[PDB]
Ligand binder design. Structure first.
Ligand SMILES: N[C@@H](C[C@]1(C(=O)O)C[C@H]2OC[C@@H](O)[C@@H](O)[C@H]2O1)C(=O)O
Length: 250
C-alpha cells in the first residue's frame, strides 16, 4: 500500500512542524528531508507514512552481538520501505542495506567554541585535558572506531576509554556541551553550517576529516533504490536540491 518511511529528528532535516491547528499524517513533520520525501513521492507516484525510528538511533553494529540498530536495522528487518534522513552513505552500511545516489555531500569536522588555540584534530588528539566525542551509534563515531589513520585511531582510543562521559545521545546534547564545558564535538559539516549560523560563539575547527554523502536508504535489493536515484538526479539537475538547502539553511 503506502510506503513506510523511517526518519529521525535532526534540525533542519526533520522537525516536528509547530502549529496552532491540529496537524495530521505527514503534515506533522517538516524539514529539508521532509520536502525531499514529498518530491520523491510525486515524481515516482507513491503514497507514504512517516515513522520516527524507534530506538532513536541512526545505525551502527554492536560488535558484541553483531546486531545493527537504528534506521539501518529497521530497513534490514523490513519495518520500513525507505529511510529518508541525514543518513550517511558508508561502506559498512552498504554491506547490509542499499542507498540511492547522494542528495547532499559533506564531511566530518570539529565544532568548538571561538577564541581558542585549537586548530585541528591533531591539536585535540595530542592532549588529554579538552574532551571530545560524537553522537553514539552514528556514522561519525563509526568513522573514528574504524580508522587506521593514527591521529583518528588515537582519538578513538581516547573516546572509547571515556565512552560514557564523551559520547552524547544527540546533536543538541553535543552542542550544549560545547557551549558550557571544555568540549569539542565531532559532527558533519552540513550540520555545522546550520549550527554556527545560529550560535555566534561556535565555530568549525580545521577542515573536513573525510568526504561522504547523505542518501536514501532501502532494504537490500529493493526495487525502489534505482527509482529513488533517478528522482534525486532530476531534482539535482533542475536546481531543486540547491533551492531546498537554501530554504532550510538560510
Ligand atoms: N549522519 C550520521 C549521524 C550523525 C553523525 O554521526 O554525525 C549523528 C548526529 O551528529 C551531529 C551531526 O553530525 C548530525 O548531522 C548527526 O549526524 C549518520 O548517518 O549516522
Amino acid at each position: 500500500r503506502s510506503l513506510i518511511v523511517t526518519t529521525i529528528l535532526e534540525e533542519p532535516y526533520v522537525l516536528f512542524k509547530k502549529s496552532d491547528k491540529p496537524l495530521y499524517g505527514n503534515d506533522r513533520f517538516e524539514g529539508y528531508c521532509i520536502d525531499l520525501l514529498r518530491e520523491l513521492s510525486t515524481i515516482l507516484g507513491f503514497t507514504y507514512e512517516i515513522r520516527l525510528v524507534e530506538d532513536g538511533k541512526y545505525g551502527a553494529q554492536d560488535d558484541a552481538n553483531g546486531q545493527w540498530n537504528g534506521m539501518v536495522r529497521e530497513l534490514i528487518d523490513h519495518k520500513a520501505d525507505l529511510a529518508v534522513a541525514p543518513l550517511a552513505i558508508t561502506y559498512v552500511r552498504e554491506k547490509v542495506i542499499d542507498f540511492s545516489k547522494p542528495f547532499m555531500t559533506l564531511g566530518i569536522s570539529i565544532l568548538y567554541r571561538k577564541g581558542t588555540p585549537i586548530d585541528s584534530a591533531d591539536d585535540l588528539a595530542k592532549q588529554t585535558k579538552i574532551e571530545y566525542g560524537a553522537v553514539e551509534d552514528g556514522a561519525t563515531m563509526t568513522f573514528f572506531k574504524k580508522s587506521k589513520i593514527s591521529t583518528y585511531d588515537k582519538m578513538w582510543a581516547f573516546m572509547s576509554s571515556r565512552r560514557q562521559s564523551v559520547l552524547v545521545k544527540s546533536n543538541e546534547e553535543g552542542i550544549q556541551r560545547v557551549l558550557t564545558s571544555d568540549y569539542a564535538f565531532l559532527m558533519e559539516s552540513t550540520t555545522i553550517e546550520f549550527v554556527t549560523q545560529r550560535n555566534c560563539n561556535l565555530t568549525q575547527i580545521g577542515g573536513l576529516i573525510d568526504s561522504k554523502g547523505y542518501g536514501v536508504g532501502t532494504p537490500m535489493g529493493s526495487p525502489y533504490r534505482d527509482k529513488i536515484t533517478i528522482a534525486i538526479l532530476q531534482l539535482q539537475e533542475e536546481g531543486k536540491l540547491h533551492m531546498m538547502k537554501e530554504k532550510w539553511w538560510r
